[PDB]
Design a protein around this ligand. Structure first.
Ligand SMILES: CCCCCCCCCCCCCCCCCC(=O)OC[C@H](COP(=O)([O-])OCC[N+](C)(C)C)OC(=O)CCCCCCCCCCCCCCCCC
Lengths: 70, 80
């Protein structure tokens, strides 16, 4: 006879339990990365703001030199 | 004070972080070394015109030319 039957060795194991990976860095790592990015941005903004102040002083002194003719 | 700090860090970390940032912003400019540098940077910006003065003949500080060594310079911000 022929009928719907599982095979001679049966069917294989089937996973039925939860599997969460558990991934990412430790919280100290992202805190250190954020703090380092903050410090780098602070340093770059400091340098560029000082340069901008120097350029503004230069432009203002050019204006002061140009004033009497106007 | 460690147990209380751990308790508030476990319950709401946002308040602990906010109070830490507030305390840092309160106590750090009072310990900053560049605040007086900011003071002279703000004071050295030439907004209005530097009008000259009349001469009675007795002044050792003010110059007669902008390129004379007498008078205040601005070397500290140029180097920094
Ligand atoms: C603009 C550029 C791109 C940005 C990123 C865009 C892609 C990522 C988007 C992600 C999804 C966003 C939408 C879904 C979430 C919406 C809800 C939401 O945002 O809720 C806010 C959530 C809500 O929190 P909650 O939902 O967990 O609330 C639970 C609250 N308790 C624990 C009390 C029960 O978080 C906040 O409100 C926190 C605000 C942001 C915190 C940022 C911290 C920055 C670092 C500070 C210093 C840290 C160091 C320690 C101190 C050091 C001091 C010197």
């Amino acid at each position: 006879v022929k009928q719907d039957m599982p095979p001679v060795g049966g069917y294989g194991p089937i996973d039925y339990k939860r599997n969460l990976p558990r991934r990412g860095l430790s919280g100290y790592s992202m805190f250190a990365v954020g703090i380092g990015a903050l410090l780098f941005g602070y340093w770059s903004m400091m340098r560029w703001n000082r340069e901008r102040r120097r350029l503004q002083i230069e432009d203002f002194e050019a204006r002061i030199a140009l004033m009497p003719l106007l | 004070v460690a147990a209380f700090l751990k308790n508030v860090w476990a319950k709401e970390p946002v308040l602990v972080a906010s109070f830490a940032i507030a305390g840092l912003a309160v106590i750090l400019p009072t310990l900053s070394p560049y605040t007086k540098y900011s003071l002279m940077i703000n004071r050295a910006t030439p907004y209005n015109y530097p009008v000259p003065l009349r001469d009675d003949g007795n002044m050792p500080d003010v110059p007669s030319h902008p390129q004379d060594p007498q008078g205040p310079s601005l070397e500290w911000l140029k180097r920094l």
